[PDB]
């Protein structure tokens, strides 16, 4: 019933990664946790990309999917995103309470 446990573990594993990672020399988008996915250090003008977060209740059904977020040509993250691959396979229906909780984690 409580899968908030996995989201906080996912975030601090990302924070641990940022505390034990040498950043790339040059211009790159900083690795961070946007409360949805853990993003690695990404070169500029490059569509960053990681697997679907494993805190999702439907993670295994999309364990092979990926999240997308375009890094700008300046080291800052752009607005362009794509979480469609990691979405709920059957969107509206059950999973309300977490679809609802995840909607707050935006």
């Amino acid at each position, epitope marked *: 019933g409580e899968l908030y446990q996995r989201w906080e573990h996912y975030g601090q594993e990302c924070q641990k990664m940022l505390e034990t990672t040498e950043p790339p020399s040059g211009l790159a988008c900083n690795g961070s946790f946007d409360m949805y996915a853990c993003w690695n250090y990404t070169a500029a003008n490059t569509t960053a990309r990681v697997s679907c977060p494993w805190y999702l209740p439907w993670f295994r059904q999309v364990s092979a999917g990926f999240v997308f977020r375009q890094c700008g040509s300046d080291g800052q993250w752009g607005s*362009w995103r794509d979480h469609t691959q990691c979405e709920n396979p059957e969107k509206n229906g059950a999973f309300q309470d977490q679809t609802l909780i995840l909607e707050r984690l935006q």
Partner: antibody
Amino acid sequence: QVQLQQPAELVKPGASVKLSCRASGYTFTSNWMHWVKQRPRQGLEWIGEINPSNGRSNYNEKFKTKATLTVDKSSSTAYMQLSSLTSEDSAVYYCARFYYGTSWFAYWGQGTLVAVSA
Amino acid sequence: DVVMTQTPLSLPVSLGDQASISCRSSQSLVHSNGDTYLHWYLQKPGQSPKLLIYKVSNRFSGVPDRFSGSGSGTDFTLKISRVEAADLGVYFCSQSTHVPPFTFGGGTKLEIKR
């Protein structure tokens, strides 16, 4: 429960005006705010986007000197400003914004009809 | 920038038929993903556009099955299986693959033919 509420607006030629777009139903710093110019019976024109968290705005290369995007985080309202208004500005100005985790405009305000006359 | 042209500019019909509209971009919209980021919008008279379809063929929340999208690369199409009275309006196609800037099609008025 996402809602973007916008004011019509009456301006004088050669004067600047500022159009409000108040957000509600979501954490306002978590999503960029776009702006689209439209003269109904014609096409849509994307002005630019503004990241509310830091104020970083990138514009379309046809609306820079004309438009300036602002953000008021306390009231969770994003604005968008035109200076030296012309007859070419009599149009409807929407504020749009992607569905979360996407890049397609799933939410729109109902626009502000701007009419330029003294 | 990517130029989106539609055909027809005014495509007429009446109630119960199968209508279909085409959109075409100056470039290919297949991003490095392998996906295509073309979207469809319906703007009813005096209102804001409403998202009908995203990623070529994916239907948005609360859109009837009558709307169906297809196409690849540079040509895309939107089919209305049965045109009701709520389907009339101006249909816009939009791309988000090559941005900025975000570009829209010229739009097309769906109307009654008598």
